[PDB]
Amino acid sequence: ADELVFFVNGKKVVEKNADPETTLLVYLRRKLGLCGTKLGCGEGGCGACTVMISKYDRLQNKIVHFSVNACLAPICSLHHVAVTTVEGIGNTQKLHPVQERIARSHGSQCGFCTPGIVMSMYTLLRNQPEPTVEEIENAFQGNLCRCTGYRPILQGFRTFAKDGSPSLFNPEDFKPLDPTQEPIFPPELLRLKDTPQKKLRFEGERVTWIQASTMEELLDLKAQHPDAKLVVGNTEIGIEMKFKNMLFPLIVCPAWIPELNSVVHGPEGISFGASCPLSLVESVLAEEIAKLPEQKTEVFRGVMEQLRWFAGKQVKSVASIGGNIITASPISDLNPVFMASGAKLTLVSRGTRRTVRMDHTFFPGYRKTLLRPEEILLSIEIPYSKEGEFFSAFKQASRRENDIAKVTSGMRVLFKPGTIEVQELSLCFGGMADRTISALKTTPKQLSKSWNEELLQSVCAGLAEELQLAPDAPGGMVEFRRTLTLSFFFKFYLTVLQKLGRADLEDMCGKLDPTFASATLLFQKDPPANVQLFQEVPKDQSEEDMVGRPLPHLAANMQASGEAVYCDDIPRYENELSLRLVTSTRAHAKITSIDTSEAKKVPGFVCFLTAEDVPNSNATGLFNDETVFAKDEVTCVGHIIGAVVADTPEHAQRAARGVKITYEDLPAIITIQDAINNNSFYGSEIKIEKGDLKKGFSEADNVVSGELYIGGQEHFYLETNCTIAVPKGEAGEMELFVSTQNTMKTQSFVAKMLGVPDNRIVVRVKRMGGGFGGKETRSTVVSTALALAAHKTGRPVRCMLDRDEDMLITGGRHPFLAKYKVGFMKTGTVVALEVAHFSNGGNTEDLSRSIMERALFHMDNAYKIPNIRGTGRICKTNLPSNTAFRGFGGPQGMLIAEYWMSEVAITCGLPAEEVRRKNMYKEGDLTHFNQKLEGFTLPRCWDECIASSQYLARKREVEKFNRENCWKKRGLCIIPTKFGISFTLPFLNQGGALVHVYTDGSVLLTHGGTEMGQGLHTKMVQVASRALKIPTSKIHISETSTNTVPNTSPTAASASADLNGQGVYEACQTILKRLEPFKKKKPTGPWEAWVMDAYTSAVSLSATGFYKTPNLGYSFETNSGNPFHYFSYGVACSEVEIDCLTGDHKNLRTDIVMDVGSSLNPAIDIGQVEGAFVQGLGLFTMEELHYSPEGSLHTRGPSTYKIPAFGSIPIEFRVSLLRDCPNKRAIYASKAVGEPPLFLASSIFFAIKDAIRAARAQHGKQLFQLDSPATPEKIRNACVDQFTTLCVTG
Ligand SMILES: Cc1cc2nc3c(=O)[nH]c(=O)nc-3n(C[C@H](O)[C@H](O)[C@H](O)COP(=O)(O)OP(=O)(O)OC[C@H]3O[C@@H](n4cnc5c(N)ncnc54)[C@H](O)[C@@H]3O)c2cc1C
Ligand code: FES
Ligand code: FES
């Protein structure tokens, strides 16, 4: 009646008090303690929560398997299914092939996404034990990885496909797959399939769930309670409940009802039950497309095209067709298609049944349909196309707001038979209004007309008038969206001409020029082809000496098995409490009142912490200008005001909603331009200048000025910020488990806030699911709050941020505005450069000044400039404080450099590769800050990359492509980089290690570095194993702790292997020195005997080690002293193809040559080049944050913030590590690698810029603007043509 019964990894679970609000993810993690399955977003975008469901399909009489997002799956929908998690398929004692292959192929860095990807791949193999390469890629459309750049995951998994320097891994050593050895379908569920299913009722704290067994039950419940909210896949309702704080006290799930799941062929088309998952629609229509003649399947193919780039497998397996229709989002991709095809909907209640052909009337208002409150949608008939009936579907792949302002379209034409004269014409659009619309003013005009140029121009003129948007229209991108509607129609117009041509008419139609053909092609991925080149170690190097060898990340197997422990995977103490932050909804305001009266009514509520609860100091942050908790004034949307403490996260979340703040607004400073004209800055102008600007400009042949805007970036570490604080009840003692790159500042900020000495506070980091600089300082806003809750209650307290919280609160990369003026000769030789930089720092200083320093240190990028002036000013604004992000001001400084350089080349009429080459530093040159460039490997990186990329021959093919294609264009660009290695604050260039050798010969090592997926622990073990001359297997690193190594620098500035490697090395030398006498006396006898002899001789088997980078210290005052220990160098050539009509593009090929000295670990270093490059690809081409005019972040999750996906990476992706370039002054001649490759993705940006120019010359001013990121909006709008001109002005 009442019991919930399902299986998890083959074990029966009986839940007697199922709460309808409980997700499967919460149940697995908090009820069953299976923490392999992760929380990444709670929104269905990221796949970190992916698990497999197995059930008996009654309607097909078979056992089916499908993946779902556990974060959105109500347990109440899972009666009598079997769940399989990552723990179900294998472990480190016996890894599944999927697990083994992702680990051994270097497909797991931080490891947080690994379980989810493993389960997506696993599920594919249960459905198709021999998939194509294409099926394998498609399996991950719902899986995001922030670290790997995807290449190693696809390459490792490519071994499962039927259609498949040393090597980074060996596929021959992989255990083969035996599909027979997968776990049995629970026989109990096969026995129960025979029992008839009856109605179930679950009653939660707030919500009642009725699982209906028949159409009669459902319609009865809706007739007596029209308020009953239907839930099917929960992919929309789940979001409304979790993120829009909507509550539906009565839910009915009709997913079991056969009539809602049926597929019926009829004379007019195929009828699908409303609750049919989109994956079933997809599989049914695909069989129909393959079997039926083309003339019948035009609408089917439009549906399939919309479903191609539509969430992943996890969403489509449970997302219902009916759910999509009734949600009635303005940006549904299906509703425009159903509307344009006039699909027939059947609506029923108790005692009524009606039919409506979908038209403009079906959607009368925002998120409304014409259903009555007691009706449900039974079914939708997707029609066969008739003879002379054509359909195209189109969509903007670039989303900015939750549910508006993304163009998506269905388009249909019916011709009078035998003719090219229009009988019917339907053009329907999402993203152009608060509902799906039809262009009903434009289409009637076209009836009778022939399908020709006069129709094209009439429809375009019509759409430009009818689809008007106010310049402040919701969702922005007004010109782009308008342009897309015409551009989509043009594609349809041309596509119809093609189809017409194929039909052998009496009246001849109009032929496409070959240069227009590529305009109608549907997206097609060619076969991936990846190359990784590195250097073999010397032949005489011991097999036990792993330095320079591609040893897998030490945790890779455990990460793939879901056994690796991240903060929130740590079990709860029974007395443990949960914290939830309460943040400002205003950019700048006084707090006038706080009312907690509603918070207090929430079960399990404990307290609301505010400034007045802070024992000692409310002043925190790097430069002591931040509140722990807001006092009288809030200074950004996201400013932490206080913290709810309750028994559970859900109770904390409800209580936080019941904290009402009243505000009195104050003048806000939001943008860089706001800050400039209010003189609102963090300290004074920073400046570097050399030579004589006046003389430089006055002697140049040409001068070019301009401006550039570069948007910021969210880290999107797949593990959000998380802290557990455990008060020990003695002497103010507290222990914190933190996802942080900075144990020292965590400890120090907690101690100061509480007013206790540092020696009472321990911060422990096992690993992070990613960091990328966003946990270098901003993690402490969570730590501090949670430390306070722990102190006040005397109980352990935990807080893991949800994605929307984390993105809003913790800031990101700094946006930059630059104004430049460059003076150059006709040869392209730069003689003068002046750059004013402005950064948007937000509402605390944090690292903003150091970041501006690093931009200024790299404003030269690779180029010697005799006369040069750079200034930087950091803007103070009412925004979340921006912080460190991999590159730390470098990529911003360097993009500006490459931007005016691109204009230098164009202005001169000279090849860009030549202009860059002749301006490049040479060995021994001084930089603008007077540091000498020794071991200047950049020229070799360049020469190698030119040859290996075949750049000159590929330039010719690009030019050829461009002459042959009017509406697609290609671009090709090769970009170098210099990146300075060391913290800009000299004393931070220090590190420590501590080593123990126990009496069994095993070694326990620790150092100040934190693991966040970069393989630092792996490297340090490799180092320790060489230093001590024992195998890696005898050495273990458990974690990083302030009570084993104190006063550590943050894990940052790419320098952690350098600093800690030396520390580790020194501690090992100390141990060796002490073992030397025992070695001498038994030079053969083994390690273990030396150690036991040392012990029983009372010799210390414990040592510290320490290192400081020598001889650093720059003065801005005298422009002297070396800020860097050395420089990293690299070069990337990238090629793109843009679609001039949509602003979409493909990354066709990227070739990278990177100097990492003699790599400690080429697998890991190649991993880092690829990951860094792909994060840069994101910065420069996708990844736009949007803010309201009043400074509220609107982009708070993967629905609206698009980080690179599996499908985003360069189709051919080649990486080489430079041979024979030892770097004497770092550990074992290695170089740092983490940050330097990031900027090389600018090569995709400038290739796009080259493509845009070619498009502009096709129709038909030379230095056009391309801001960063170069999104579809910016690319399309810059591709000026008849459509952009019409939309901007008749
Ligand atoms: C990560 C992600 C990506 C997505 N991407 C896209 C995309 O690219 N394009 C796109 O168009 N959509 C997209 N969606 C939306 C998705 O297609 C819809 O959420 C889904 O189809 C809703 O189906 P459901 O069964 O999950 O509905 P639920 O969330 O269970 O219900 C949705 C609504 O429909 C009502 N309802 C459901 N069935 C019936 C019925 N038979 N009769 C009457 N009312 C009913 C419910 O009461 C509810 O109001 C995305 C969703 C997610 C989570
Ligand atoms: S946590 Fe479920 S999709 Fe991201
Ligand atoms: S390894 Fe994939 S998110 Fe870090």
Side-chain angles (χ1 to χ4, degrees):
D2 205 34
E3 276 191 352
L4 175 65
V5 182
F6 66 96
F7 283 77
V8 180
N9 302 147
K11 189 164 161 180
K12 175 157 121 181
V13 165
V14 178
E15 178 51 58
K16 292 172 161 213
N17 302 286
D19 195 315
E21 285 191 78
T22 303
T23 66
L24 175 61
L25 171 66
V26 168
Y27 201 86
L28 294 163
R29 283 176 72 66
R30 274 154 57 201
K31 186 83 179 219
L32 299 180
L34 296 169
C35 288
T37 311
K38 313 295 186 203
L39 178 62
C41 75
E43 190 184 289
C46 88
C49 64
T50 307
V51 303
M52 200 180 76
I53 304 305
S54 294
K55 71 186 184 175
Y56 182 69
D57 195 333
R58 303 180 160 246
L59 210 131
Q60 296 206 233
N61 310 25
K62 42 177 217 152
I63 300 166
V64 296
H65 312 288
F66 56 90
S67 66
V68 310
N69 296 129
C71 67
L72 283 178
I75 63 178
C76 283
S77 72
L78 295 187
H79 189 66
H80 287 180
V81 313
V83 185
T84 303
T85 70
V86 67
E87 298 101 343
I89 68 158
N91 54 44
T92 47
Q93 258 52 240
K94 187 176 160 74
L95 289 165
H96 195 272
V98 172
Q99 290 166 331
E100 175 187 55
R101 296 193 199 189
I102 190 163
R104 290 189 176 188
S105 63
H106 315 290
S108 193
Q109 283 188 27
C110 83
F112 204 72
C113 67
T114 306
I117 286 169
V118 156
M119 292 314 298
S120 283
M121 182 64 222
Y122 179 88
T123 299
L124 173 59
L125 293 172
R126 295 300 307 274
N127 283 294
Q128 176 53 73
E130 286 203 69
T132 64
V133 173
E134 184 175 33
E135 293 174 329
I136 292 170
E137 176 159 303
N138 279 347
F140 307 122
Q141 218 169 299
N143 291 269
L144 296 170
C145 177
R146 193 44 157 180
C147 289
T148 69
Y150 296 114
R151 186 284 299 159
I153 304 181
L154 293 180
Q155 199 174 263
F157 279 166
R158 192 155 289 117
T159 59
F160 285 117
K162 65 180 200 212
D163 64 347
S165 158
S167 321
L168 282 185
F169 60 95
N170 190 350
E172 284 92 54
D173 199 36
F174 292 167
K175 70 213 262 190
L177 178 72
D178 180 351
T180 67
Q181 294 313 111
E182 302 306 339
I184 190 168
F185 188 66
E188 187 154 8
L189 292 174
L190 279 185
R191 286 198 282 282
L192 275 161
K193 70 100 145 50
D194 288 316
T195 302
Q197 66 207 337
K198 49 190 180 57
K199 196 177 79 217
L200 256 28
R201 182 171 179 116
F202 309 111
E203 275 172 320
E205 292 199 358
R206 297 192 295 171
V207 181
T208 306
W209 177 294
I210 287 157
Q211 188 80 31
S213 57
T214 74
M215 187 67 39
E216 191 168 347
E217 286 163 355
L218 164 60
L219 290 186
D220 270 338
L221 183 62
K222 285 290 286 173
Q224 305 293 52
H225 302 280
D227 43 281
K229 191 54 149 201
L230 267 76
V231 170
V232 177
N234 194 49
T235 61
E236 166 65 23
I237 295 308
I239 299 301
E240 285 178 14
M241 284 164 50
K242 176 60 186 155
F243 296 107
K244 298 187 194 136
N245 297 309
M246 286 167 189
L247 170 63
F248 307 103
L250 176 59
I251 283 180
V252 62
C253 179
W256 288 348
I257 295 168
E259 291 91 342
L260 288 163
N261 281 278
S262 62
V263 179
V264 170
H265 294 68
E268 288 297 309
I270 301 174
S271 271
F272 295 85
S275 301
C276 290
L278 290 175
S279 58
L280 175 54
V281 176
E282 271 199 295
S283 67
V284 168
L285 292 186
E287 204 216 23
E288 294 291 336
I289 285 156
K291 148 88 98 194
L292 294 180
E294 164 152 47
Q295 130 200 354
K296 269 171 87 89
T297 58
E298 290 277 317
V299 189
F300 300 173
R301 277 183 277 108
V303 177
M304 291 297 287
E305 205 65 47
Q306 290 303 73
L307 288 176
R308 267 180 72 169
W309 304 116
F310 179 125
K313 306 295 295 209
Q314 299 93 329
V315 170
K316 285 196 279 194
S317 60
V318 297
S320 73
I321 182 156
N324 188 277
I325 295 149
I326 307 296
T327 298
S329 168
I331 60 170
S332 162
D333 293 308
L334 305 190
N335 279 340
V337 159
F338 297 151
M339 186 183 291
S341 68
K344 158 189 134 194
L345 303 186
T346 304
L347 277 41
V348 291
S349 72
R350 188 58 128 89
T352 70
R353 176 166 174 133
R354 51 158 182 162
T355 288
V356 299
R357 278 140 207 120
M358 188 179 295
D359 68 6
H360 74 283
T361 288
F362 185 81
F363 301 109
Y366 175 66
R367 287 189 164 245
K368 299 210 205 176
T369 77
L370 50 58
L371 271 78
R372 305 200 299 278
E374 77 274 8
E375 275 175 321
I376 68 89
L377 174 64
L378 176 56
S379 74
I380 172 166
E381 186 160 70
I382 306 177
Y384 297 118
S385 37
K386 299 164 189 304
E387 179 69 7
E389 192 177 39
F390 305 119
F391 206 85
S392 290
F394 305 96
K395 68 174 165 196
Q396 175 181 336
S398 49
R399 237 278 267 340
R400 185 143 201 68
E401 294 273 1
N402 163 56
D403 78 345
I404 49 164
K406 180 201 90 212
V407 185
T408 170
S409 183
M411 301 180 173
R412 189 174 59 79
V413 59
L414 177 65
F415 291 113
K416 308 192 175 136
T419 79
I420 57 162
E421 299 150 45
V422 166
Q423 205 188 322
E424 290 171 18
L425 177 67
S426 183
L427 308 171
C428 298
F429 298 93
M432 292 306 293
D434 66 355
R435 65 196 97 208
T436 303
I437 54 170
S438 179
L440 281 163
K441 301 186 195 186
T442 292
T443 51
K445 293 165 173 153
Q446 317 303 330
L447 305 192
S448 278
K449 298 192 175 177
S450 282
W451 200 261
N452 58 32
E453 185 71 22
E454 199 170 349
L455 176 146
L456 172 66
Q457 305 276 218
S458 178
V459 164
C460 289
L463 300 181
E465 183 261 315
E466 174 173 26
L467 310 181
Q468 197 43 252
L469 295 169
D472 72 340
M477 298 185 158
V478 159
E479 287 174 25
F480 175 46
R481 286 191 284 162
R482 275 171 53 74
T483 302
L484 281 180
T485 69
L486 269 65
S487 297
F488 288 162
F489 183 77
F490 182 56
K491 280 195 184 194
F492 173 67
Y493 171 75
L494 290 184
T495 306
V496 172
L497 277 184
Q498 279 185 313
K499 281 158 181 182
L500 252 13
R502 248 185 303 282
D504 190 44
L505 272 284
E506 305 267 62
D507 311 315
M508 114 181 158
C509 42
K511 284 143 281 161
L512 261 62
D513 195 67
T515 75
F516 279 38
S518 69
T520 70
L521 265 349
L522 307 176
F523 204 93
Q524 176 76 59
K525 194 203 165 78
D526 268 38
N530 314 315
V531 169
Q532 305 84 39
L533 297 193
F534 61 100
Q535 200 170 358
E536 68 290 346
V537 299
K539 163 65 194 319
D540 69 308
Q541 185 173 309
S542 176
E543 288 310 291
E544 287 196 344
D545 173 357
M546 302 309 282
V547 174
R549 307 194 182 268
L551 181 73
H553 191 301
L554 287 189
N557 296 334
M558 290 178 271
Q559 285 167 6
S561 75
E563 277 167 287
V565 179
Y566 302 82
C567 199
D568 190 53
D569 307 326
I570 297 166
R572 297 201 161 233
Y573 287 104
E574 46 183 35
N575 64 339
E576 189 151 324
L577 289 177
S578 311
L579 179 141
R580 172 91 166 177
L581 294 172
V582 168
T583 65
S584 169
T585 61
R586 301 289 182 75
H588 196 198
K590 294 193 181 146
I591 297 161
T592 55
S593 72
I594 301 173
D595 175 350
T596 51
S597 67
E598 288 297 311
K600 282 169 196 186
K601 298 192 201 156
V602 173
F605 178 78
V606 177
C607 65
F608 185 59
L609 303 172
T610 66
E612 64 188 17
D613 294 295
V614 166
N616 186 53
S617 173
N618 195 43
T620 190
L622 199 48
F623 289 92
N624 213 36
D625 58 338
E626 184 172 7
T627 60
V628 181
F629 293 129
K631 185 67 152 93
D632 299 326
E633 209 201 4
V634 296
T635 60
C636 82
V637 181
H639 198 165
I640 301 165
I641 302 173
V644 164
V645 183
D647 58 341
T648 68
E650 296 77 23
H651 285 165
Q653 191 183 334
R654 293 172 56 204
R657 263 249 324 273
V659 176
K660 320 305 194 152
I661 316 288
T662 72
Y663 302 92
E664 179 189 314
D665 282 342
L666 293 169
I669 298 169
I670 305 298
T671 70
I672 290 173
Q673 197 46 55
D674 285 343
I676 297 175
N677 49 40
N678 287 263
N679 196 29
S680 173
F681 304 118
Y682 291 103
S684 60
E685 196 182 65
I686 311 172
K687 180 165 75 215
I688 309 185
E689 89 177 306
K690 189 181 187 186
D692 184 337
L693 216 62
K694 218 247 216 179
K695 171 181 301 307
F697 282 120
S698 82
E699 287 178 330
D701 289 324
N702 297 270
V703 173
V704 159
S705 72
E707 271 203 3
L708 184 67
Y709 184 78
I710 301 170
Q713 203 184 359
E714 161 57 28
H715 308 84
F716 216 101
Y717 26 68
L718 257 117
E719 187 199 30
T720 53
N721 285 280
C722 185
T723 288
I724 305 163
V726 193
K728 301 312 186 136
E730 277 185 42
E733 282 170 17
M734 192 181 284
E735 182 195 50
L736 295 94
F737 305 85
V738 189
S739 188
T740 183
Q741 305 171 233
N742 204 341
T743 65
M744 186 186 171
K745 296 287 165 177
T746 302
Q747 171 201 25
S748 88
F749 293 175
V750 166
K752 184 184 182 224
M753 179 274 294
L754 288 181
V756 299
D758 287 336
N759 62 11
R760 300 307 200 277
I761 305 301
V762 183
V763 180
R764 295 171 77 198
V765 179
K766 184 149 209 97
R767 62 183 54 86
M768 288 162 274
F772 309 115
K775 300 177 174 159
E776 168 169 4
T777 54
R778 307 302 301 155
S779 61
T780 67
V781 301
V782 171
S783 295
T784 57
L786 189 137
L788 179 51
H791 168 72
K792 180 192 171 66
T793 61
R795 294 165 73 162
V797 183
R798 156 165 335 196
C799 183
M800 178 153 172
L801 291 197
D802 291 332
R803 183 61 61 182
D804 63 327
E805 288 185 299
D806 192 287
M807 284 184 76
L808 163 69
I809 297 177
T810 68
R813 193 186 296 282
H814 284 72
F816 263 65
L817 179 67
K819 315 183 207 265
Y820 64 88
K821 188 169 105 197
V822 65
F824 49 109
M825 311 308 285
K826 272 162 188 90
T827 51
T829 296
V830 172
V831 293
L833 179 75
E834 187 189 7
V835 186
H837 305 81
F838 297 84
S839 72
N840 200 326
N843 80 326
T844 80
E845 193 176 323
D846 190 65
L847 288 156
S848 302
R849 281 193 67 89
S850 289
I851 291 170
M852 180 54 78
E853 285 177 1
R854 182 167 282 275
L856 288 175
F857 288 128
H858 298 77
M859 63 176 292
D860 55 339
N861 186 33
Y863 310 112
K864 162 92 184 148
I865 306 187
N867 313 288
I868 188 178
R869 187 175 173 273
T871 64
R873 211 68 199 276
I874 305 79
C875 298
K876 167 179 174 51
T877 65
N878 301 112
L879 293 173
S881 186
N882 288 324
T883 192
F885 198 144
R886 199 178 192 169
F888 198 88
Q892 297 98 314
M894 293 183 287
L895 194 80
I896 291 147
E898 290 300 353
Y899 194 94
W900 57 252
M901 180 65 71
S902 83
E903 298 191 328
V904 171
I906 281 311
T907 297
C908 288
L910 284 171
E913 72 274 9
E914 282 177 27
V915 173
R916 289 192 169 86
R917 188 52 180 93
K918 61 149 66 92
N919 276 290
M920 193 174 288
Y921 290 112
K922 64 167 192 302
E923 172 97 37
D925 277 347
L926 274 46
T927 65
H928 55 307
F929 50 94
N930 287 141
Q931 182 161 2
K932 187 204 180 96
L933 304 170
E934 298 173 339
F936 187 65
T937 56
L938 183 63
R940 294 176 59 206
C941 292
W942 182 266
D943 289 337
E944 280 184 15
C945 190
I946 278 169
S948 68
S949 69
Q950 303 195 253
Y951 172 85
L952 288 180
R954 301 220 344 250
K955 201 184 191 208
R956 293 268 277 167
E957 212 72 0
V958 163
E959 287 168 347
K960 204 205 182 200
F961 185 86
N962 287 353
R963 291 183 283 274
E964 299 184 357
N965 289 275
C966 176
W967 299 114
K968 295 195 168 38
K969 298 295 178 178
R970 288 179 182 189
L972 184 70
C973 190
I974 182 166
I975 295 290
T977 198
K978 159 169 64 50
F979 188 106
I981 303 295
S982 279
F983 293 88
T984 63
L985 181 55
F987 64 78
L988 286 179
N989 297 282
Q990 59 175 111
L994 176 77
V995 71
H996 304 135
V997 182
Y998 298 107
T999 58
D1000 67 357
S1002 63
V1003 185
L1004 180 56
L1005 173 65
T1006 195
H1007 61 82
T1010 58
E1011 181 59 44
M1012 56 190 184
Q1014 85 280 37
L1016 175 56
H1017 290 155
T1018 307
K1019 284 183 179 174
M1020 294 303 90
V1021 162
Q1022 296 173 259
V1023 167
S1025 147
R1026 168 180 280 197
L1028 290 174
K1029 304 187 85 278
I1030 74 181
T1032 56
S1033 60
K1034 272 162 196 183
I1035 306 181
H1036 191 260
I1037 301 178
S1038 286
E1039 65 163 31
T1040 313
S1041 189
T1042 60
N1043 69 343
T1044 60
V1045 188
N1047 317 133
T1048 57
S1049 296
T1051 302
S1054 300
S1056 301
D1058 287 28
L1059 297 170
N1060 289 290
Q1062 294 285 351
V1064 163
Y1065 169 96
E1066 291 304 349
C1068 289
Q1069 299 304 312
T1070 295
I1071 296 305
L1072 280 198
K1073 175 91 166 193
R1074 292 181 193 170
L1075 286 180
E1076 211 167 340
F1078 307 99
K1079 202 156 76 77
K1080 180 182 178 76
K1081 276 186 210 174
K1082 296 183 207 174
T1084 287
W1087 176 251
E1088 288 73 26
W1090 300 334
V1091 173
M1092 191 66 90
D1093 284 3
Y1095 171 60
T1096 60
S1097 291
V1099 172
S1100 179
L1101 293 175
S1102 192
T1104 67
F1106 184 87
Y1107 172 82
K1108 90 154 187 273
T1109 310
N1111 293 323
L1112 300 173
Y1114 174 80
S1115 169
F1116 277 86
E1117 298 82 17
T1118 67
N1119 196 25
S1120 59
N1122 301 327
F1124 306 117
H1125 192 41
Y1126 61 92
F1127 300 81
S1128 164
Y1129 298 106
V1131 180
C1133 182
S1134 290
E1135 183 185 357
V1136 303
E1137 176 170 322
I1138 76 177
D1139 179 329
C1140 312
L1141 285 165
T1142 68
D1144 209 7
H1145 81 277
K1146 299 155 150 205
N1147 306 127
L1148 300 171
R1149 181 176 163 168
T1150 288
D1151 300 69
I1152 298 170
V1153 183
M1154 204 76 53
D1155 169 16
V1156 302
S1158 324
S1159 181
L1160 294 164
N1161 190 326
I1164 283 167
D1165 285 348
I1166 288 177
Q1168 288 299 106
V1169 164
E1170 284 176 320
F1173 181 91
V1174 166
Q1175 260 182 328
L1177 181 161
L1179 173 62
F1180 293 138
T1181 66
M1182 27 201 90
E1183 293 191 59
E1184 197 159 38
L1185 300 165
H1186 192 253
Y1187 303 77
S1188 71
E1190 315 82 24
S1192 179
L1193 179 71
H1194 279 160
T1195 176
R1196 292 195 190 180
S1199 66
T1200 54
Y1201 188 73
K1202 315 314 294 194
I1203 68 160
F1206 275 79
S1208 301
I1209 66 167
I1211 288 165
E1212 301 179 56
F1213 202 180
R1214 296 191 168 207
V1215 176
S1216 299
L1217 305 187
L1218 188 73
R1219 304 169 62 82
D1220 302 310
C1221 52
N1223 177 43
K1224 59 188 185 167
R1225 61 196 37 235
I1227 183 69
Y1228 290 132
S1230 57
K1231 285 186 176 185
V1233 66
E1235 297 172 290
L1238 187 138
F1239 176 69
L1240 289 184
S1242 58
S1243 67
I1244 286 162
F1245 177 95
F1246 286 107
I1248 287 165
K1249 196 159 146 80
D1250 185 49
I1252 292 167
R1253 187 170 298 289
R1256 290 173 68 103
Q1258 179 81 245
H1259 322 83
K1261 68 194 156 189
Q1262 267 214 317
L1263 300 191
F1264 63 87
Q1265 192 63 19
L1266 190 61
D1267 282 330
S1268 180
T1271 53
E1273 175 197 20
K1274 297 208 187 63
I1275 297 171
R1276 180 65 189 98
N1277 284 354
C1279 292
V1280 167
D1281 64 20
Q1282 56 264 49
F1283 308 111
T1284 71
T1285 302
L1286 176 51
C1287 289
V1288 175
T1289 180

